[PDB]
Ligand SMILES: NC(=O)c1ncn([C@@H]2O[C@H](COP(=O)(O)O)[C@@H](O)[C@H]2O)c1N
Ligand SMILES: NC(=O)c1ncn([C@@H]2O[C@H](COP(=O)(O)O)[C@@H](O)[C@H]2O)c1N
Ligand SMILES: NC(=O)c1ncn([C@@H]2O[C@H](COP(=O)(O)O)[C@@H](O)[C@H]2O)c1N
């Protein structure tokens with residue numbers, strides 16, 4: 001609880017007065033040598049130059065954290081981002097797409113049984129989910145307020161006043177803004193924002 | 207106050223168990239029936255027809271497979287029990303079944319709830335129009351969930367030392383006495399020598 | 409020669425369709441019933457009781473959801489149609505449902521078969537004690553599958569220009585005339601103006 | 611003539627096994643590596659970078675979990691093995707993983723194939739843009755499948771009495787000698803005293 005301010009990987013999703021969004025932040029202790037990279041309609045969490053090797057030491061440190069498929073934004077702390085986005089692309093409602101992926105992928109097999117978390121949002125709805133050694137949960141994001149979840153400590157949706165009017169601001173906020181400023185070991189962050197004219201990506205370093 | 211269908215699962219000083227209770231307004235003409243290693247919620251004599259009016263009112267609410275007890279408010283009881291029987295951990299068996307079956311397509315989008323318990327662990331789950339949830343039942347305390355209102359696990363001091371008592375308790379005992387429209391209930395208890403079934407009417 | 413429950417799906421010069429036929433030995437006291445956008449296989453008057461003896465004899469064999477027709481030999485018809493209704497491509501909808509429901513737990517491990525078809529594509533699938541299979545129906549030709557013997561898609565020249573004809577054909581027409589113990593059949597046809605239902609008795 | 615990634619599974623007079631072979635044109639700079647109870651297909655020194663160009667070229671092709679051997683052409687090897695480890699029959703473990711993972715999103719929609727074998731049974735499966743298939747491997751004979759051309763189980767007289775021989779055979783032996791672009795292979799054999807791993811280069 002209280003003295004444990006290290007949430008590990010964090011993601012937020014929802015809508016505010018300026019538009020819809022998904023934010024993601026990498027918090028790490030054992031692998032801080034990483035950054036976010038923007039590529040065609042996706043943001044990848046990858047090793048910074050010199051540490052390419054790391055992906056061979058740990059299979060959970062490199063993955064697309066954000067995938068944009070049509071009007072849908074997908075965010076997750078691992079390779080399941082692709083699993084989910086692909087299902088949405090091929091036609092599958094958000095809840096099931098997240099549910100099926102997490103159920104199959106399951107929690108990560110590391111020394112902490114690190115959970116797999118994810119969220120997806122489109123024009124009319126948004127869902128957030130997590131899978132751990134103790135269970136599986138996927139739930140509708142209340143339209144009334146953005147929420148966030150992490151792999152450690154905050155392993156269930158938590159309401160948050162996420163103020164941001166662009167992907168750059170969104171990424172900066174989950175990295176240093178509001179309640180997120182208190183969560184330790186920030187490394188890198190990324191976000192996708194949609195003010196109505198489409199999904200835009202952005203990244204932010206410390 | 208009207209929770210609709212209710213189920214509880216967990217362990218107490220006397221043993222392990224699953225309890226189930228039918229609460230209904232539109233279909234109160236039902237009872238529980240014990241058959242080989244399962245308890246079915248069925249129409250009382252004269253209303254056989256009902257199953258043809260509504261496809262969610264008749265189903266096995268309890269299935270015993272080996273050392274595992276399965277309880278649910280619908281046909282997914284069989285979907286889950288079958289997977290356990292064929293080898294699948296409780297969490298996934300409940301998760302896969304609920305994900306596929308989904309909430310019931312009635313005027314209320316009535317959720318599908320379920321729980322399963324064996325010698326070492328127990329899980330409880332629910333699927334609704336707003337999501338899916340399957341979670342480990344804390345060994346420290348029994349829990350219960352319903353299709354309406356109490357749509358998330360809630361701790362309960364479930365005192366019972368037999369299937370008969372367990373069934374009677376979810377039907378009229380403790381906090382359950384306040385939940386309206388009781389119709390019928392059933393339960394499975396295991397004091398260590400195996401699963402036993404029982405039913406209780408109002 | 410006794411294939412048990414049979415279903416066909418595909419397109420011909422007159423339109424798209426799904427046909428279903430009940431072949432039975434132990435439960436021949438059944439018929440098809442048309443209700444809102446679905447066809448149910450149910451007991452004929454006097455045998456309502458049967459559904460309580462065997463849980464696999466009564467179920468919707470056909471469900472129409474928007475531009476999609478779904479057909480299957482069991483309750484998974486609803487599981488699949490619901491997923492399509494909520495947005496899920498045909499292949500996955502059939503795949504997920506069969507994977508979860510699994511083969512029927514009777515003395516024969518009777519397989520669960522299904523097919524779904526819409527404006528652009530169609531899929532057919534089956535799940536048995538030996539595996540799971542879901543595949544794209546070739547646009548070049550209609551196919552059919554059964555719970556016994558013909559447990560894999562088989563091409564068929566399915567001539568029919570209406571649901572009535574389609575139902576009659578899978579019941580007595582072509583190659584289907586040779587399959588024993590026909591009881592009842594139903595079908596859904598779409599000539600471009602929408603899905604229409606029909607049933608045919610012996 | 612070019613089958614791409616290939617895997618075989620089954621039993622012969624000497625024991626049980628799973629073999630895997632990487633055939634490639636665009637990425638031939640790879641080898642197999644043995645680590646604790648698993649074999650990984652990885653880039654040879656100097657090409658570490660490749661994994662960042664294509665996400666489907668590096669993955670564990672073989673995982674041993676207890677008495678079970680798992681083989682696949684991609685990261686789903688871990689998805690399947692993990693489910694078996696946590697308790698899930700082989701058919702479902704392969705089915706669920708393939709259904710979720712789906713075919714690879716490359717310029718060829720490269721299928722995901724897999725197989726798993728333990729003391730009593732074995733299953734093989736594949737998922738492609740046209741469908742999903744998981745089926746019981748006949749005990750009477752070993753089978754193999756590939757991502758291209760041979761996209762359905764094919765019987766094979768797989769002679770081998772050790773992991774080394776098994777790996778060598780799928781790489782250059784029998785019918786496999788005719789399949790083009792061999793790069794590296796690996797295998798797991800169980801003569802009754804446990805699973806042993808081995809790799810073979812050209
Ligand atoms: N998703 C990630 O970026 C990630 N980074 C690390 N991990 C897992 O969590 C473990 C501990 O991470 P850390 O010590 O940075 O909190 C790592 O060893 C790995 O197994 C992840 N899931
Ligand atoms: N589980 C049950 O026994 C059950 N009984 C009814 N129902 C569904 O809930 C609806 C409302 O039931 P009630 O009026 O008992 O609250 C019914 O129309 C039906 O769709 C059930 N799922
Ligand atoms: N789908 C059906 O209509 C059906 N009817 C019967 N059955 C199952 O197959 C068994 C054998 O049926 P029959 O004797 O008609 O070949 C029945 O006892 C039951 O378990 C079915 N699946």
Ligand SMILES: NC(=O)c1ncn([C@@H]2O[C@H](COP(=O)(O)O)[C@@H](O)[C@H]2O)c1N
Pocket residue numbers: 614615632633634635636637651664666667668683684714716717718720
């Ligand atoms: N599993 C593998 O080893 C593998 N190697 C390559 N591939 C995918 O198949 C594509 C074509 O492979 P190739 O060019 O070797 O026939 C590659 O570009 C990649 O997308 C694989 N799945």
